């Protein structure tokens, strides 16, 4: 029962940003480029083409990190581990 109950629950994020480039992803103060990028999609689907191609990565540590940012550290995209 304990094992079954621990396979459907989700997880939140308590930090406000990653720890390798600063910035912010959760609290108010996002870059307007991201807001414009969201406006491009789901409104007319004209063309989503911009350097902003970094999908955020969520972890059990709740810190959160990008994909290209972690790729900069020569980390293969199959062994993502938080830096604690």
């Amino acid at each position: 029962q304990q094992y079954r109950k621990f396979l459907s629950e989700g997880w939140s994020i308590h930090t406000d940003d990653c720890e390798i480039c600063g910035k912010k992803i959760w609290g108010a103060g996002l870059d307007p480029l991201l807001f414009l990028a969201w406006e491009n999609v789901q409104r007319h689907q004209d063309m989503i083409s911009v350097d902003l191609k970094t999908p955020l990565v969520i972890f059990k540590c709740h810190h959160g990190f990008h994909q290209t940012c972690l790729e900069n550290l020569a980390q293969k995209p199959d062994e993502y581990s938080c830096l604690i």
């Binding site: 307007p32 807001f35 969201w38 406006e39 491009n40 409104r43 004209d46």
Partner: protein, 613 residues
């Protein structure tokens, strides 16, 4: 385009639409018939070679009464496929009689015409695919409209009414930064703001403001922008802003108010700001009349630019998209052109022939202009400058003005327009003229320049330009010597007699009260504010206009930068020169913004004088 105003990208759409329509007319040999007023705009967009190669049309003509005599000569000949007229009916709501008389007389068997209109953004890309046959004809457009608009007067001859709505949206011609809309003239060459018939001002003003609002709505909906702050100046701007707000809040579709909730919204914002400062030319009639000193200003008031940005006497085009010599010399002062040209010519000597031809043509034109400045009533071009500089600071004495007005009236020959402009500036600078000088000045004017001059001096004596000491339309009722104290127009400045325009300081005060801090200041709400605000600056503008209601500040959203400074009543091109200086100095000081100057048509002193006549 897409929140980034790629102005040059606007040009392609109009050409593509026109080409598609013309090529879909008929696959045969076509003859084009173009209205005289709209033809220069079309030639500035599509070249003759491109027009010939892209579509099978091989002839272009003009709407004139000459075609009536040429109906048996030109219209009778050619006519390989059909005749396709092109008309402009955006203003004056009346088709030219030339087509009306040509249709019945020559008896054309196929009538197809092209009419211009602004882009209908409300059509929202045909609204998907009509909702799968309107969900079983649940919606229909048959007879759900008035039978006709404007063209209902066309109910004669045959039923050949194959109308074609060619779209049109503003595009820049003179420079990359500034667009331009042609809504200040009719087909009869009558000013849209200063008509020569003082019986129908209100309707003409309403039509002008309606057309300007329509153009702004078209551009705003094309670029998908969300106005946040509005700073309206004057009376007409108030009505314009209210009408624009109502029309935006009425005709907007769905799927964007949802975005209007996500973006901006309550308790949050995304740091996007657009400003819509609006001015009226009647607010500051001080500086449409000064003498131009920049290169294009000097070249403009001596040879008038037509609807297209070109001139009749010369042949080379002044378009900026193919030449770079014109880019770096158009707005520079006339004095700093010679040595710059000498350096440019001498640097190429050590060093493709198109550049040589361009520099040779520019050198020849500059030499001709320099030659024509002198030896043509020598000293007048400078004497008017010294007189204007003396008058602006204020040195008028008792009855001595009558000695100098006729000093250059016939000692050096001069046109009527210069004298009339100078006397208008004299009567306007002091904000009032006594009752003991009109009896002589008007007498001398009617003495020297006919009997009809009394009508001109009477009609011009009610718009505020020519007033006497003994629905207000926001005139100016304050002495200018006072304004030289609050503001620092007379000390950085060019294109004039070393004077900063009044609109310049009016826009300066909205973002940085530095010059206002030096004079008439003990406390201010701020020193550097990003957002436009107006507070504790009422009394100064209360006396300046006689009513503490000309200033209007509107916030629309509840809670680097694109500022749309439209100009209702023409742009004196010298202001464009100082706008770049403002942008540079503001960027240097710390506030980074970008200015787009929307213009309804270039306005100039002499071009005004023929208007009120």
């Amino acid at each position: 385009m897409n929140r980034f105003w790629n102005t040059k990208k606007f040009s392609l759409t109009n050409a593509d639409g026109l080409c598609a329509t013309l090529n879909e007319i008929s696959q045969n040999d076509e003859v084009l018939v173009v209205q005289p007023s709209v033809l220069p705009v079309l030639n500035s967009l599509l070249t003759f070679q491109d027009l010939t190669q892209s579509t099978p049309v091989r002839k272009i003509t003009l709407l004139d009464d000459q075609l009536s005599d040429d109906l048996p000569s030109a219209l009778g000949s050619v006519p390989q496929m059909d005749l396709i007229f092109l008309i402009d009916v955006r203003t004056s709501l009346r088709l030219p009689p030339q087509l009306l008389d040509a249709a019945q007389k020559h008896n054309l068997s196929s009538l197809h015409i092209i009419y211009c209109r602004w882009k209908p953004s409300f059509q929202n890309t045909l609204e998907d695919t009509e909702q799968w046959q309107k969900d079983g004809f649940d919606l229909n457009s048959k007879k759900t409209h008035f039978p006709n608009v404007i063209e209902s007067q066309l109910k004669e001859l045959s039923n050949e009414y194959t109308l074609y709505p060619w779209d049109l949206l503003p595009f820049p011609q003179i420079d990359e930064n500034v667009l331009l809309t042609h809504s200040l003239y009719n087909m009869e060459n009558v000013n849209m703001y200063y008509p020569n018939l003082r019986s129908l001002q209100s309707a003409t003003e309403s039509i002008l403001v309606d057309d300007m609002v329509n153009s702004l709505q078209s551009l705003i909906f094309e670029t998908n922008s969300i106005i946040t702050n509005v700073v309206s100046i004057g009376n007409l701007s108030k009505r314009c802003s209210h009408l624009l707000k109502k029309r935006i809040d009425e005709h907007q579709t769905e799927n964007d108010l949802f975005i209007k909730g996500t973006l901006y919204g309550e308790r949050t914002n995304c740091g996007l700001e657009m400003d819509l400062i609006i001015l009226e030319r009647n607010t500051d009639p001080i500086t449409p009349l000064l003498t131009q000193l920049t290169y294009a200003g000097i070249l403009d008031d001596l040879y008038e630019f037509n609807s297209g940005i070109k001139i009749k006497e010369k042949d080379m085009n002044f378009n900026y998209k193919e030449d770079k010599i014109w880019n770096d010399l158009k707005f520079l002062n006339f004095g700093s052109i010679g040595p710059q040209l000498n350096k440019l010519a001498k640097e190429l000597q050590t060093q493709l022939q198109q550049r040589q031809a361009f520099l040779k043509n520019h050198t020849t034109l500059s030499s001709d202009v320099l030659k024509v400045v002198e030896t043509e009533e020598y000293g007048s071009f400078n004497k008017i400058l010294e007189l204007e500089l003396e008058i602006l600071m204020g040195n008028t004495l008792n009855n001595d003005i009558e000695d100098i007005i006729l000093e250059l009236q016939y000692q050096y020959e001069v046109d009527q327009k210069k004298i009339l402009r100078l006397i208008c500036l004299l009567s306007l600078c002091k904000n009032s003229l006594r009752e003991k000088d009109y009896e002589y000045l008007r007498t001398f004017m009617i003495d020297s320049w006919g009997i009809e001059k009394c009508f001109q001096l009477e009609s011009l004596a009610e718009l505020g330009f020519f007033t006497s000491k003994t629905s207000k339309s926001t005139r100016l009722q304050k002495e200018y010597r006072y304004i030289s104290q609050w503001f620092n127009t007379v000390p950085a400045t060019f294109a004039y007699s070393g004077v900063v325009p009044l609109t310049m300081r009016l826009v300066q005060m909205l973002y940085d009260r530095s010059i206002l801090f030096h004079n008439y200041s003990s406390q201010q709400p701020f020193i550097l504010s990003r957002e436009p605000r107006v507070s504790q600056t009422e009394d100064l503008i209360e006396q300046l206009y006689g009513d503490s209601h000309a200033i209007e500040e509107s916030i629309w959203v509840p809670g680097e930068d694109i500022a749309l400074v439209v100009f209702l009543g023409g742009v004196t091109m010298g202001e464009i020169a100082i706008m770049k200086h403002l942008q540079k100095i503001l960027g240097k000081k710390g506030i980074n913004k970008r200015f787009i100057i929307i213009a309804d048509g270039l306005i100039n002193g002499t071009r005004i004088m023929n208007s009120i006549s």
